[PDB]
Amino acid sequence: ATVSEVISYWRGLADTDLAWGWQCADVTNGTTTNFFGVTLWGNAIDLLDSAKAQGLEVIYDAPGINPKAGDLFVMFTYGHPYGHTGIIIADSDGYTIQTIEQNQFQVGGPARYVTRAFSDGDGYIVGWIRPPYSDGFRKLKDEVGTFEVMVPALNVRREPSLNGEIVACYQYGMTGTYDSVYVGDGYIWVSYVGASGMRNYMAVGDADGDYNVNPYCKFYLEH
């Protein structure tokens, strides 16, 4: 993937919803997963550690060390322990950063243009990931399980399809029961009856056939 490709994708979304076609639903792991095939686990604040562990390039903020267009920043947050992330859309002079960021729905909101200082009332920039930029459905099984969300943010839908209506977005660490597993549109899905009373579907990893080959969750089976 190219820098212009990725920035243009995010500019498109900022310029403009419940039919968004990404499953992993934050800016950073959403981008690494969907453009680079590299999935990161953790809260936003954890993603520099997870990126390093997956062999990606990570650079920590320091005097004279400033981010570039295409970099994915991690921010320590004062108001909660989970951190914040976004994509840097222009080279930084070290005093401001131009970004696109996101603003039952626990995370994964609509994208917007932001310009921020390196440290403010909400938190401060810790560092950034530099991605390696270059030049139907079917029931699989009934199963009594619980999931644990391991990615920063994960969309939940009303149908187990790429663009099924989004009804929640779960955060890292969320757990819940499920009663069945589906395959569809390149993903494995778990399914459960939501509090609304209607059935929901959540993609839990990229699929090769019936195999979850890139998991977004951990799975636990009743004993």
Angle at 59 between CA 36 and CA 23, to 5 degrees: 30
Distance CA(161)–CA(159), nearest Å, equals: 6
Q: Within 13 Å and on the Cβ side, how many CA atoms surround 221? A: 5
Q: Tokens at residue 108, please?
A: 């994964």
Q: Tokens at residue 90, please?
A: 């222009």
Angle at 139 between CA 138 and CA 141, to 5 degrees: 150
Method by which the coordinates were obtained: X-ray
Describe the strand order of the beta sheet including 123-130 as a list of residue ranges. 57-60, 123-130, 72-77, 84-88, 97-102, 111-116
